[PDB]
């Protein structure tokens, strides 16, 4: 598990997840159920399974460079220009060939979500759960031929933060019919760059396609989490992107130990999408 | 609320549910999300505004004889004789005109699940929890022009149990693309016939049809539900059914304190739903 990395379509073990003990709760009023267990809801054992497969397909030397996230913006079909429209009126997993979402939302929402995150992380009972992290910076991609290498520049000293690959592993679509956009949850890899010096080989040349994202992150450690909210310059397009990002360590300390104990991988994932509904939610009762 | 009954298409306020607050356990190692709370999952937060909104379109003296009830089986649509399926992966409300599930499930699948369920009874931790009560009844269906009442007969004893006229008010069907069956959700009314005689009128004429029911029923009053595993000679087509069915007194007793303390109401809709999820989780594993 550790040490191997095994194909998804070989993979043959699905570690057992249970599902949450009634808690030691004053005695409730009703047993959760009659085998007084919380049986994981079936979004969430999927995101479970295909998180856990696409970890363990993945070599054990480059799962630190993992980066699980979850964008919001709609789903969108091959064959038409507008927001998929399945038979189906509750969130799932929406899997039809050559559907796609880009990562956009409305900007008067953008706005107002922002207001709201920001007053959520100020009231006096929260404040030492989350750090605020502003940004800007200006992604160039250049093609080695053929590879594509992203070089990230800070806007005020000028120095290249992150010189790397990014590959696409894997990306789940979640169709979220009562809500005004869907997700794309997506694990990549971001690979640095090996002996390639970033500044010397490539202040030269013209990257083929350049990004300036204005960022506004909320940290909260206590739920492994990060959100953020950018606006970003596409050369130019411009988009409004809002992600949610679990923490790479907490996540492969969690996968490490799911053989041993399993309840700290199953609770991650769990407050995961927790963290997702939120702002799902807030982001579909703005809309009104 | 109490005492009005609007019509599902004209109802305005949606009562709020709030979210389980985390829980008194032992400081958990991550908190549940960054609010500090556990948003309901997409598909009971579904269930909940359905049962809500149904509810509120009986006239409240027709409310006590509802019967909540979640039955088994697959759901087949309009044009092909073979289950759904649409491009989704894991459970939702499945909405497609003309979509039917008829409740039988394999008779070797019902027969491990008796089993399985019956040993789950007699576990010495969680026989106080259940009662087991088996029965045997015929119930033939007489149309009086046009309506149809449905008489009750225990096989023994002849006595004739219920007398009802059954209205079926609202469904909803959960494709579970996991499970090797769907489940259908339904809202029947089961009301009882006024001043016609049960045993003087009809002991004369012909049913028009005729179902006998052998069934093995496990109470779990701690959880307000009731597991009802039925094989019913249809006339004779042969079913396997398996139904959950809700206390009726508990659902109106949450649904009238709905604005006062919604707690009760989001509770037992989520233990019924993580009931209905056992037993089909279950049936899936039996499957293999």
Redesign the interface.
């Known amino acids: 598990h550790m040490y191997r990395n095994v194909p998804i379509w070989a993979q043959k073990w699905k570690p057992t997840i249970k599902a949450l003990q009634s ?4 005695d ?12 994981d ?6 995101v479970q399974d295909w998180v856990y497969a696409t970890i363990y397909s993945i070599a054990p030397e480059l799962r630190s460079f993992i980066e699980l996230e979850m964008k919001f913006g709609v789903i969108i079909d091959a064959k038409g220009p507008d927001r998929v429209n ?11 060939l050559d ?1 796609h979402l880009t990562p956009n939302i409305d900007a008067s929402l953008f706005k107002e979500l922002s207001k709201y995150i920001r007053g ?1 992380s100020e009231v006096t009972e ?1 404040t030492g ?2 750090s605020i992290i502003e940004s800007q910076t200006r992604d160039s991609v250049y093609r080695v031929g053929p590879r594509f290498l992203r070089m990230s520049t800070d806007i005020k000293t000028g120095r290249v933060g992150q010189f790397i690959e990014k590959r696409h592993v894997a990306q789940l679509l979640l ?2 019919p ?1 809500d005004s956009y869907d997700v794309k949850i997506s694990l990549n890899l971001e690979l640095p760059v090996p002996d390639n010096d970033p500044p010397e080989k490539y202040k030269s040349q013209s990257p083929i396609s350049e990004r300036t994202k204005d960022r506004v992150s ?1 940290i ?1 450690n ?4 990060r ?1 953020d909210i950018t606006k970003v310059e596409n050369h130019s397009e411009t988009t409004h992107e809002v992600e949610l990002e679990i923490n790479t360590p907490a996540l492969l300390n969690a996968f490490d130990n799911i053989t041993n104990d399993s309840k ?1 991988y199953a ?2 994932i ?2 995961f999408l ?2 997702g ?2 702002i799902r ?1 807030k982001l579909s009762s703005l809309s009104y």
Chains 1, 2 share one sequence.
Do not use: G, M
Request: glycine share 0%.
């Open positions: 808690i030691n709760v004053k409730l009023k009703i047993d959760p159920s009659f085998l007084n267990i919380i049986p809801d079936d979004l969430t054992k999927s399945p038979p189906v009126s509750s969130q799932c997993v929406f899997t039809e559907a959520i929260n759960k989350f169709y979220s009562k909320y909260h206590d739920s492994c989490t959100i700290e609770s991650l769990r407050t927790n963290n509904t939120i939610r």
